[PDB]
Amino acid sequence: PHMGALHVVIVGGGFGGIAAASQLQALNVPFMLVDMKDSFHHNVAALRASVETGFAKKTFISYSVTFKDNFRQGLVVGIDLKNQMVLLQGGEALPFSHLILATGSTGPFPGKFNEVSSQQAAIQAYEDMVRQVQRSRFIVVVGGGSAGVEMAAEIKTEYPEKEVTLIHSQVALADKELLPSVRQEVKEILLRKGVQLLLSERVSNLEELPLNEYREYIKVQTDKGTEVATNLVILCTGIKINSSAYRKAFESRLASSGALRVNEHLQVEGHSNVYAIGDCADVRTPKMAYLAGLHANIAVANIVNSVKQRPLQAYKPGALTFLLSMGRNDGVGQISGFYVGRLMVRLTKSRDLFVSTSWKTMRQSPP
Ligand SMILES: Cc1cc2c(nc3c(=O)[nH]c(=O)nc-3n2C[C@H](O)[C@H](O)[C@H](O)COP(=O)(O)OP(=O)(O)OC[C@H]2O[C@@H](n3cnc4c(N)ncnc43)[C@H](O)[C@@H]2O)c(O)c1C
């Protein structure tokens, strides 16, 4: 029973959620931000944190330092649409006048990390990975999506003396929606770095392999009968929408891919006070962190505009921007649908992986 007042609940503390929480905090609008972790995860640097000693502490930022009592650690199990509540594992419910859904994507470690944990435990998880990689002479990266391609390049750039094999089910690497010129140069670069590519093969004994853990001997098998002996197997396939929090309640609304369908104001179909942003929004985009932030300014503005009776603003997708990091000294990609080269990507993404951006948003300084 909110009797006109606002109470905004942000479910998910990723790039979008912290963008929305910071906007609401600047306008002094009551809000509660919920995340299962206690710190924000700059997952765009997760692969460098998998290979560089001491980097991982640059990639987690305490929520409570920035948001204080406007943050609440918890796992969201369900939405009660009728009574405008948000159901937390353990019983607690959070009442909202407006709801921002920002639940991001789920995937294998190290590319994603969606574990309830402390900041120091999360950091330690990546430092542990680095020791697995240091220990290993032979490493297999499974999956030539954008994540595997960068993971293999990241290992070879930091450890030229390791033997890195990348195994991928198709014949072209990285996202299908990229310029063919982009996809080809990614192959050129991986080969010049000494990565051994096993294209058009599928790993067949995967349920039996130890993941993210050094072993003296591991044999990876493919459906074509190729056997690759290795010390470490890193899995880089299986990014999907994290609908844990909202699926039971919006089944009618979830598009097939897990995302919530939305209008051009990022409103969830069938609701005027429920927004979806970033990865969980059905936008036919490639799903980018920077987009998650833009969506967040859109959603907060449209909550304020909906109270101040004003025309909502819309989200106008443009041409494809995505830069692939090929280690710290190389890369390639496209900015608004045209090709950008190695020097450009190295200065934009590959040196700092946009890490300083999240620390600025969170108003904190890295350790
Ligand atoms: C895999 C990958 C992705 C890249 C990459 N690079 C870029 C890049 O250069 N630029 C960019 O803009 N995006 C890039 N992205 C995409 C970017 O990582 C994602 O699109 C971005 O993180 C999406 O932002 P969202 O806020 O939509 O989602 P997050 O996963 O960041 O945050 C979701 C949060 O919700 C929380 N959460 C979800 N369900 C929950 C629940 N039920 N209860 C509690 N918390 C929950 C999660 O724990 C997590 O903290 C990249 O190189 C790779 C390899």
Numbering used by the authors: 7 to 373
The authors write:
Ferroptosis is characterized by unchecked lipid peroxidation and disruption of the cell membrane, resulting in mortality. The intrinsic cofactor extracted from recombinant hFSP1 exhibited a main peak at an m/z value of 800.276, indicating that hFSP1 primarily utilizes 6-OH-FAD as its cofactor. Next, we determined the crystal structures of hFSP1-6-OH-FAD, hFSP1-6-OH-FAD-NAD+, and hFSP1-6-OH-FAD-NADP+. The 6-OH group is reflected by an extra unambiguous electron density at the carbon 6 position of the isoalloxazine ring of FAD in all three structures, further confirming that 6-OH-FAD is the cofactor intrinsically associated with our recombinant hFSP1.
In our structures, the additional hydroxyl group at the 6th position of the isoalloxazine ring in 6-OH-FAD generates a new interaction with hFSP1, which is absent in other NDH-2 family members. The 6-OH group is engaged by several residues of hFSP1, mainly Ser152, Glu156, and Lys355. The hydroxyl group of Ser152, an initial residue within the α6 helix, hydrogen bonds with the carboxyl group of Asp181 to facilitate repositioning of the α6 helix. Additionally, Glu156 hydrogen bonds to Lys355, enabling the side chain of Lys355 to be located within the hydrogen bonding distance of the isoalloxazine ring of 6-OH-FAD. In summary, hFSP1 orchestrates a spatial rearrangement, driven by the interplay between Ser152 and Asp181, to enhance its selective binding to 6-OH-FAD. Moreover, the isoalloxazine ring of 6-OH-FAD is nestled on the hydrophobic pocket formed by the residues Val50, Ala153, Met294, and Phe360 and hydrogen bonds with the main-chain amides of Ala295 and Tyr296. The adenine ring of 6-OH-FAD is stabilized by the carbonyl group of Val82 and the side chain of Asn248, while the 2-OH group in the pentose moiety interacts with Asp41 through hydrogen bonding. In addition, the pyrophosphate moiety interacts with the amino groups from Phe21, Gly22, and Asp285, and the ribitol section contacts the side chains of Asp285 and Asn49. Overall, our observations suggest that Asp41, Asn49, Asn248 and Asp285 are likely required for the binding of hFSP1 to the 6-OH-FAD body, whereas Glu156 and Lys355 are associated with its binding to the 6-OH group. To summarize, our structures first illustrate the molecular determinant of hFSP1 for preferential binding to 6-OH-FAD over FAD.
